Known about the structure:
Chain D is an all-alpha fold.
Amino acid sequence: GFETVVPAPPTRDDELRMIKATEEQFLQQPRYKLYMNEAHRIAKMNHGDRHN
Amino acid sequence: IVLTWGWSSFQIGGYNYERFDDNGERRNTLYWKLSPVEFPQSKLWNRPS
Amino acid sequence: PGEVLPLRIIKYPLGLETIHNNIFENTNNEGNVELFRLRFNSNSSKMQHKLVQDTIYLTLKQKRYNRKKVVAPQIKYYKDDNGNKTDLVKYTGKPYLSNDKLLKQSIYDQTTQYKLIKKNKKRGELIPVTLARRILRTKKTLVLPAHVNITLITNSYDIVHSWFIPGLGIKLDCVPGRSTHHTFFIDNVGFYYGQCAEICGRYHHHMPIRVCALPFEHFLLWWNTFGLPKMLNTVSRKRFETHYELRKYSW
Amino acid sequence: VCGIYVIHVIYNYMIPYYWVSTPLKNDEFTRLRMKDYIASTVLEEVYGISYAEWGWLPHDFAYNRMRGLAGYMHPDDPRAMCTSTFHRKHKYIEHEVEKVGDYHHMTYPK
Amino acid sequence: ALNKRNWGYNAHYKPELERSMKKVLYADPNYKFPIEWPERYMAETKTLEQVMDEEENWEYYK
Amino acid sequence: MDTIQKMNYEATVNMGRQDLITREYTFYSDYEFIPIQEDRKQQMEDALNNLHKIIHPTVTQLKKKANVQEIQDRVFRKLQGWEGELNTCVFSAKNVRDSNFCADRFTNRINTEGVEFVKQILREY
Amino acid sequence: RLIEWQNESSLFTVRVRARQWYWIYKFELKNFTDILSTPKNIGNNRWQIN
Amino acid sequence: AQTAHQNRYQGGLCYAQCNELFSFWNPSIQQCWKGCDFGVGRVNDPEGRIEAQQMCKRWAAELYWTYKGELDTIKDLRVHADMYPTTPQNVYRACLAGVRRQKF
Amino acid sequence: MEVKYRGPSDDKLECEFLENNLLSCLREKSVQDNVAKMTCRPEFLVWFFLECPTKAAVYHDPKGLRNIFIQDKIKQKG
Amino acid sequence: MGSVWFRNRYWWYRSLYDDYVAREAKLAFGIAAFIWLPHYYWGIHLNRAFEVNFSHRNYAHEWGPRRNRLAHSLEFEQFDMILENWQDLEDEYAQRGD
Amino acid sequence: ALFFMANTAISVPSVLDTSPCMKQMLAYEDCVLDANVPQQEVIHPQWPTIWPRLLTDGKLLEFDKVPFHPENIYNYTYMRPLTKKNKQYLYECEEERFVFKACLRKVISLKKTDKHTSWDTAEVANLQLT
Amino acid sequence: DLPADYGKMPAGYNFLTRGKDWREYDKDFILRTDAVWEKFQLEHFFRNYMKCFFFDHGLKKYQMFEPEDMYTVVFEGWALDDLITFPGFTPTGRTNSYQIGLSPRQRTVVPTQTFYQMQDYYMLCGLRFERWFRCDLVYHDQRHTKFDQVKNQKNYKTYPCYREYYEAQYACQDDMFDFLMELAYARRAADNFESDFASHELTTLPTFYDTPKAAERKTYTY
Amino acid sequence: MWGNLWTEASYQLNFNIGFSSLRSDVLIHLAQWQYWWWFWFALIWSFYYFI
Ligand SMILES: CCCCCCCCCCCCCCCCCC(=O)OC[C@H](COP(=O)([O-])OCC(O)COP(=O)([O-])OC[C@@H](COC(=O)CCCCCCCCCCCCCCCCC)OC(=O)CCCCCCCCCCCCCCCCC)OC(=O)CCCCCCCCCCCCCCCCC
Ligand SMILES: CCCCCCCCCCCCCCCCCC(=O)OC[C@H](COP(=O)([O-])OCC[N+](C)(C)C)OC(=O)CCCCCCCCCCCCCCCCC
Ligand SMILES: CCCCCCCCCCCCCCCCCC(=O)OC[C@H](COP(=O)([O-])OCC[N+](C)(C)C)OC(=O)CCCCCCCCCCCCCCCCC
Ligand SMILES: CCCCCCCCCCCCCCCCCC(=O)OC[C@H](COP(=O)([O-])OCC[N+](C)(C)C)OC(=O)CCCCCCCCCCCCCCCCC
Ligand SMILES: CCCCCCCCCCCCCCCCCC(=O)OC[C@H](COP(=O)([O-])OCC[N+](C)(C)C)OC(=O)CCCCCCCCCCCCCCCCC
Ligand SMILES: CCCCCCCCCCCCCCCCCC(=O)OC[C@H](COP(=O)([O-])OCC[N+](C)(C)C)OC(=O)CCCCCCCCCCCCCCCCC
Ligand SMILES: COC1=C(OC)C(=O)C(C/C=C(\C)CC/C=C(\C)CC/C=C(\C)CC/C=C(/C)CC/C=C(/C)CC/C=C(\C)CC/C=C(\C)CCC=C(C)C)=C(C)C1=O
Ligand SMILES: CCCCCCCCCCCCCCCCCC(=O)OC[C@H](COP(=O)(O)OCCN)OC(=O)CCCCCCCCCCCCCCCCC
Ligand SMILES: CCCCCCCCCCCCCCCCCC(=O)OC[C@H](COP(=O)(O)OCCN)OC(=O)CCCCCCCCCCCCCCCCC
Ligand SMILES: CCCCCCCCCCCCCCCCCC(=O)OC[C@H](COP(=O)(O)OCCN)OC(=O)CCCCCCCCCCCCCCCCC
Ligand SMILES: Nc1ncnc2c1ncn2[C@@H]1O[C@H](COP(=O)(O)OP(=O)(O)OP(=O)(O)O)[C@@H](O)[C@H]1O
Ligand code: CUA
């Protein structure tokens, strides 16, 4: 369908915020759940929670 | 028969070959630095190949 | 079968070419990109032309050495052969390569020397394979550059064969119907002989291979002077044509 | 040991072969590469460069480093992705490269 | 900072002779190279006539 | 001209003249139909050009190939239904009058219905 | 690791065909341009494409 | 193979971010790691970031045949999971993503 | 790569050919290739020095070069 | 080494093969401590030869073209000197005009 | 494996280049590469004299009775005369060229004489032993 | 102090050093004690390495032949054929003496990673030829009208399926390519498109890539 | 023989026991591995001799 507006390339501050968010998510990942680092890791974890 | 001849013959032969035949080097070559190296004997002829 | 329909609507493929980041490759005369094409059939009861073979290969046929009955002298005729051939003879000679790497005129009978060496050559108990190449002679040795990767695609016409070079320690099985790809990398300048290493039939014993890996400059010289002209000899063949090609494509 | 190896070989090579058997309308190349990655990137024929000094001498090590960089220069290569980097010095002694990453060409190690 | 490396980028000529003019031209901050380093390894797009015209109309920064 | 130029010209003309020599060969058992006329061919080409003109702005503005592919697929489905109708009508057509009638119907159907559908889908996108 | 898994990265391609009882070596037309576009090493290990 | 580390674990958080960004079968992770290596010690500098971007341009140009202006005219510099390093544009985009993920 | 040694050939015909090529190159380069046709062969210029040291020494000699130039001018005039 | 590390040497002998060759196994160490020296030294020599060969291969691959280009430039410089002398002679001839 | 070879000859160093003017030649080549002149003849330090026409017309070969059919900028790079930009960026590299030519001239002037007595055993002085 | 225009090329500057004094450049280079020996060794090596041609006393020219084994060169020097005049390494007399490397790769439309596990590449050849024929079924009859095969070669455009053609040629051996070309001829004569015969998508299993919104399926990020 | 550059890589004699050539890197590695294979049999050979 319609395409959304593509934002301009992020600045260094935006990159740092993204890095901090990724670190927070990685820390939030449970230790006993064995999911590989990949683009679908979060989708796989949500699917696993629903399956549980 | 078993140990000393078997473990010293090839090395003795290679040493003598280097002494008396320049490890089979083909002379008339230029610029040894660029030229390939003619290796000493490395295949054990006394051992069963 | 089924006849070509009067009209077909064909979608123009999009994104095949990524040059300059242009999804659309076809633009109408009015300046609008085209997404569809109309193809019309006329004279339905008509033959369809076969696909034109647009594949050009420089082909070298490596066969076992053939004995020479007579050593013919080198003869060169005049140029400007507008006719079938020029009867006039410009130069005729009997060159031979001396130990000084010079092509000097021979004062001996080349045929007599060839016959004598064929019949009663002198051999020895410990004779190097380099000077004893009885069953390892071919023609049109395969010339490659050194210190670079090459993609060798191996195949056979009739049955399974084995391209074997013990000097390089390379054995490639050429099987009919397969397009096996191999990486070939010779890290030195050298000339290697080889034989076939798979029972094939009558001449399994006599089917040699000669591969010469040379520095890229010598390889390029050999290419430009022997192989590149042949790749256009199928259509254009002349000394001036070869000169034009080598001047146009200079490395 | 043989049974575990055969099970791994099956999982990588036999069962995935049957996943795709016809042309695919959507993401055909993506799915083909997904099924081929597990088979073409097995560690048996990928791992080892990390301890290449066991067989490669310093000068031989540098020559093989440049050769491997040329061979795996192709970006589209999961095997190259999983292979250990060639941008390193011989642990015993290095004769050609004094510092890693200080080159005159982003591809050639020298 | 310790792990920072150039990785072969912009590895242009580094003069060693004291009186080489490059040793001063490269020091000059307002020095323009004939072509950018990334473009130095990319295929040309302009036609021969266009390239010749651009080179003829090119003016040295000084 | 030089020898190379003459060879290139000969190659170009021979490549272009494939149909010239292919015409002479024909098959007896063949369901021969009446080819569409040149006027109708030009009219259908003009209709296609009008559709392309209407579609050009939106597709050019779009930056992702997926949306362009979807638009192309939908328009192609419609045009393919109409193409099947035209083919079945023309193949059974017993005269150039019937062929011209079928072509006129097809081009008018394009110019009205396909134009409306293209406008609708482009506005949706 | 050195003598395999490098088909994608090669200077050019040569086709070796075996028949009863001789060999045939074929160089595709693209080999000509591949050889023409070979980088040259000049200077202190710098690479140039002409 | 062409990265700066023997194994991806030796690399810092940038390698993990590249793995998360790209799918496990997508070889753009290697280009992202190259971008990380280029950005090591340069992202935190206004000139260093531009130098890393130019290094990415040069790396893509050396990896694939490319013309002048293509990388400048790339429409979208964003990268998705199924983007492969089959073109100079894709290589450059992956390298830029790696540089962005690079922290120190 | 093993390269076998071989001193300069000093062959009469080869050195004559190389000297003729060198003379043609000198004549053209003196006028800066302002001639109707060009016959320079820099590769043969290199091979002249590589193969015929005696003629190279004669050319380097101020008197030998003067004599060669005088003879060349006489031949060209005649 | 071997059985001595075990506090049940009878069990050590029994559980492996129920055979006793300890006398020969422990008398072989003395001979093995010196039978290897000639092979080791010849192998050191061969490894050095291989290293020299690899270094020569690398040097050739990296510098042979450079040496050839240097020789070509040297010969071109000789020709340049001869050309300068020839130009001087031609200028003198033009000025004099025999 | 770990120590299967049982020894590594780390002492054997990379053979050192001993050519007379290698450094000068490499410096000149790097300067020319920076200049980025499409013509390759510039690699030779004496190009302005070996190919005088490269500065005026660019015709280095006589195309007589041979067709001249260029197709792109990479066909006849040696037939294009140097432009103002190339001339400037080569003039910026004259100091290296002068040093290279001086080194070549010195090497040419140096000659063998009977005074030398270590000529036969010159490999040791050349450091061919390891 | 500098004249503020250092490095500027003087107007009319000529790259000539006819009367230059080289004594001032003596201190800028260092020559080792064995400079004469190095010069002689360089000359010997160049003469014995770069000379693949031989002078002939009959034609007064240099001639060469294709590479031959030592046995042929030595024991059959009096019996040689196919001698060809030596044209030179380069047209202008420059040097081709360089160390070559690997050129940058070509962009790929059909990745080799689809069947990179197999060394035979027969599946990859089939897939590439299928894609090339899909493009050909569109552009074949226009190739001679508005593409490279036009008579007016000045305003020529490259054939759109060129890259697919070259990839298929690389992946396929000549015999397999001939088989596939015969199949392509038959299919074009029948005027058959795979789209009008394909119905296996109905029987193919679903996947996330089959979602009705392919454009919205993908997620983009910097 | 490419001019004075001897390109022949194999000079094996009638009674050759080793590899045909040792210029190739693959053959050099194989020869080194084969030579060092027999170096690690000292203890076993001595034990068998005593037995
Ligand atoms: C055809 C013919 C030709 C051949 C053709 C080719 C054929 C090819 C065939 C290929 C076949 C492949 C298979 C090969 C294997 C076959 C095996 C088979 O069939 O037989 C089964 C055979 C059965 O076992 P075994 O070999 O009979 O076991 C017996 C032991 O090996 C033996 O050890 P043990 O413990 O039982 O008895 C010895 C021990 C017993 O003696 C003792 O009582 C121990 C004493 C310890 C203390 C010593 C010092 C005391 C000092 C006191 C104070 C002195 C006065 C003061 C002086 C002060 C100043 C000087 O004493 C020692 O000698 C140990 C000393 C420790 C050594 C290290 C010390 C380092 C520091 C220095 C200390 C000493 C010197 C300094 C002194 C002071 C200096 C200040 O082997 C096996 O079980 C399987 C072997 C498989 C291979 C790997 C094995 C690894 C495990 C370890 C064993 C390794 C050795 C044996 C290997 C096998 C070959 C020898
Ligand atoms: C003949 C009788 C057959 C009966 C069964 C047939 C019906 C289909 C049965 C499907 C069972 C699937 C079980 C999946 C279990 C996954 C567990 C897991 O966490 O794995 C994670 C791994 C890795 O994924 P991951 O770890 O990233 O996923 C995260 C997982 N959690 C949520 C647990 C953290 O999954 C896989 O690798 C995918 C599945 C692999 C399956 C391997 C099968 C091997 C078969 C060997 C050959 C057998 C031949 C038999 C021939 C018979 C001839 C008659
Ligand atoms: C339980 C049975 C187990 C059997 C295991 C299988 C055993 C296989 C090996 C058997 C070896 C038998 C002995 C061979 C001796 C060969 C010596 C030789 O020529 O030198 C080789 C080697 C070869 O080295 P080389 O320097 O001469 O030549 C090398 C080859 N070239 C030069 C071409 C590169 O030389 C030496 O070892 C030199 C020293 C020899 C000192 C000992 C000489 C002994 C002479 C024979 C015995 C005495 C005569 C009377 C015997 C009476 C017997 C009843
Ligand atoms: C009771 C103690 C239990 C100890 C825990 C470990 C044993 C568990 C039970 C046996 C199964 C072990 C499977 C390990 C590997 C699983 C993953 C896998 O196959 O892929 C990794 C690797 C394959 O790696 P790869 O090359 O596919 O890499 C994947 C990642 N990419 C694609 C990026 C490269 O597996 C192998 O290589 C298998 C080789 C065969 C031999 C494996 C031996 C395992 C160790 C010995 C086990 C002994 C058990 C004895 C039990 C009875 C006695 C107590
Ligand atoms: C080539 C040079 C040598 C290199 C070093 C190689 C050895 C490295 C160490 C290996 C240790 C682990 C071995 C696993 C197998 C143990 C099997 C077993 O029976 O163990 C239970 C035994 C139990 O023995 P036990 O006698 O107390 O009880 C068994 C008897 N019953 C059943 C009646 C109770 O525990 C040990 O004693 C462990 C010994 C470990 C050492 C290896 C023994 C074999 C001989 C070789 C000695 C090597 C010494 C190395 C010293 C260190 C050097 C770095
Ligand atoms: C749990 C499994 C083990 C861990 C994984 C290990 C994988 C990596 C190592 C595998 C290859 C080992 C051999 C390397 C080459 C040497 C071969 C050799 O000498 O064998 C001949 C020897 C016997 O032949 P030999 O008697 O001729 O030995 C040479 C004798 N001299 C010195 C006189 C010349 O093999 C043996 O029987 C002994 C065992 C091998 C040697 C081990 C030495 C100690 C090293 C530590 C071992 C413990 C494991 C850790 C290894 C270190 C790295 C982690
Ligand atoms: C570390 O040391 C070691 C090695 O390193 C060298 C090893 O290689 C090895 C590996 C070695 C091996 C596994 C063993 C290899 C084999 C070996 C040593 C045996 C080789 C033996 C030979 C070559 C000799 C062959 C024996 C023969 C009898 C041949 C014939 C010779 C002779 C003199 C007799 C000739 C007679 C005839 C032909 C028949 C005439 C008579 C008749 C017909 C009878 C007529 C009847 C009447 C009544 C008149 C070991 C074990 C080792 O320890
Ligand atoms: C020990 C405990 C752990 C489990 C152990 C499992 C052991 C499995 C043993 C299988 C034996 C099969 C029968 C014997 C075949 C021997 C010959 C053989 O394998 O031939 C090769 C042939 C492949 O055919 P080919 O035309 O070459 O095509 C392959 C292209 N790469 O091979 C084939 O045709 C392959 C046929 C495979 C059929 C698979 C059917 C089941 C699929 C299940 C999917 C996974 C989930 C369920 C797992 C349940 C496990 C019990
Ligand atoms: C004495 C001779 C006989 C010995 C017994 C026979 C078997 C010997 C086995 C080999 C022994 C050698 C040591 C292990 C190999 C070392 C080299 C190696 O493989 O390193 C590479 C790799 C780790 O690499 P990487 O993950 O990048 O490292 C970052 C770590 N943060 O390596 C790895 O994969 C690392 C694996 C680690 C496994 C840890 C297992 C538990 C022990 C944890 C550490 C010790 C804890 C005790 C307290 C320590 C502090 C006092
Ligand atoms: C018929 C059989 C009778 C019984 C056997 C008697 C011996 C017979 C002869 C055996 C063969 C000897 C010749 C072949 C092997 C030796 C080859 C050799 O020495 O090569 C040189 C090599 C090092 O040279 P490299 O530097 O690599 O090369 C450049 C050379 N300038 O050399 C080296 O590796 C350096 C050697 C240095 C000196 C070593 C001295 C050893 C002394 C041993 C003392 C007693 C044992 C001590 C053991 C301690 C450890 C347990
Ligand atoms: N024509 C092509 N040439 C080269 N690579 C291609 C081509 N088509 C697809 N690819 C590769 O497949 C990947 C997925 O292709 P897809 O059709 O989804 O891309 P897209 O929508 O045009 O945009 P993008 O380049 O962002 O993925 C591309 O990223 C590229 O890696
Ligand atoms: Cu052909 Cu065996």
